[PDB]
Chains A and B, each alone.
Chain A
Amino acid sequence: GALAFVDTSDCTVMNIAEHYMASDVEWDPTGRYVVTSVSWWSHKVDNAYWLWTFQGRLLQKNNKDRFCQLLWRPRPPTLLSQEQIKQIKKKIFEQKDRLSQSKASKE
């Protein structure tokens, strides 16, 4: 396994996530995770589950024996509009979500 992320505007080769057990790579129907995971009857026991996040942060830690795949259980047809993406086309209003997470991570 040799992973790399190909970003856009500009095209770069910036990161490498290490995977020794993985066989297949498929991404989520939101845009949230692209996972590289392992198969039992096609290779040896080297087992891990390491999914790829974009920022270099860890997306999975799991070793559960003879696992074959992990992929998105899908969602409905969304029937979205361009007006909601235009508001996300505006820290400016997206300031609350980190601070609410900080109160939940307090000890």
Chain B
Amino acid sequence: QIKKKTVRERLQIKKTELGAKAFKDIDIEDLEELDPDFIMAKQVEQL
């Protein structure tokens, strides 16, 4: 009951939510790797 009370006051669900948020942030960063390549590609195809 005390462990359930401590988890409820703090909020496995929070760790999964933090992992999902980290995965979403990582997915945005990988798209930035494509885009910074593409913005460099935009420089290259222009020049």
Contact = CB atoms under 8 A, between A and B. Distances in A.
Contacts of B43: 53-55, 57
B45 interface: yes
Contact of A94 (B39, B40, B45): B45
Interface in A53-77: 53-55, 57
A107 to B, nearest CB: 23
A63 B47 CA distance: 27
Contacts of B47: 97
Interface residues of A, number: 10
A63 B44 CA distance: 28
Contacts of A57: 43
A98 B47 CA distance: 10
A14 interface: yes
A77 to B, nearest CB: 23
A91 interface: yes
The 9 closest A-B pairs by CB, nearest first: A55-B43, A55-B40, A54-B43, A91-B45, A55-B39, A14-B39, A94-B45, A7-B39, A57-B43
Interface of B: 39-40, 42-45, 47
13 contacts: A7-B39, A14-B39, A53-B43, A54-B42, A54-B43, A55-B39, A55-B40, A55-B43, A57-B43, A91-B45, A94-B45, A97-B47, A98-B44
